[PDB]
Design a protein around this ligand. Structure first.
Ligand SMILES: [Cl-]
Ligand SMILES: [Cl-]
Ligand SMILES: [Zn+2]
Ligand SMILES: [Zn+2]
Lengths: 21, 30, 30, 21, 21, 27, 30, 30, 21, 30, 21, 21
């Protein structure tokens, strides 16, 4: 999920937006 | 070390900003 | 003034700590 | 909701533990 | 500047990017 | 109160995230 | 891991406090 | 509003940075 | 104490240092 | 690397919340 | 001290409540 | 610059002020 993706390498704000409701 | 837990604190703040009024669900590890 | 936005930033950090591995939902105004 | 409750007056740990999953 | 614009009311991500280098 | 100071702290965190490699100037 | 990203976030907050009315410029790499 | 509580969060971070290894005591209201 | 002084008006980092151990 | 410094920043925020009106001592050595 | 306990491994709410005054 | 200087080891307040405008 978000930790494995975004704490291993930096997520853009477009990548982050995928995790919004 | 507690580095993954520290990262998570920043991630929540980033999601807060990006999602705005839409909100989000967050749970470590899923 | 962005008082509710500033408050929410701190609220999500507090949820992150209090909820830990359980996780949480955050969506303003509901 | 949590904003109505917790941005108007301070929420306790017990109260915050209500918005947990 | 950014304090006047973005503390009086919420700025979007796109609005905030005006202040990037 | 110091709300403009408080808001500015959150702004610089937001620019840090949004601006990425571009960076920012704050004054 | 993203520790240089995490440390930068704390640096920005520290420069905000230390620099006061002077302000600062932040650009990773230079 | 919870603005004084929000301020306190920033104050403790500022003291953390300024005091370094010396440490500090903090308690709201005294 | 520190809240009455430094949440009413901005404290410098010299003012803040007074509250260190 | 400043791992212990980064951790402490988050620790003082967590103490601020958990301790509330009771307050807390923070000193890294002890 | 708190740093040895809580920066090596994560501290619970109950454990953090130990460094309170 | 500041990342290399001040994430490899702690910077003092005076060190950090090199990066002010
Ligand atoms: Cl705030
Ligand atoms: Cl961190
Ligand atoms: Zn951090
Ligand atoms: Zn704040």
């Amino acid at each position: 999920g978000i930790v494995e993706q975004c704490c291993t390498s930096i997520c853009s704000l477009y990548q982050l937006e995928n995790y919004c409701n | 070390f507690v580095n993954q837990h520290l990262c998570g604190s920043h991630l929540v703040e980033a999601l807060y900003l990006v999602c705005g009024e839409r909100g989000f669900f967050y749970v470590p590890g899923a």
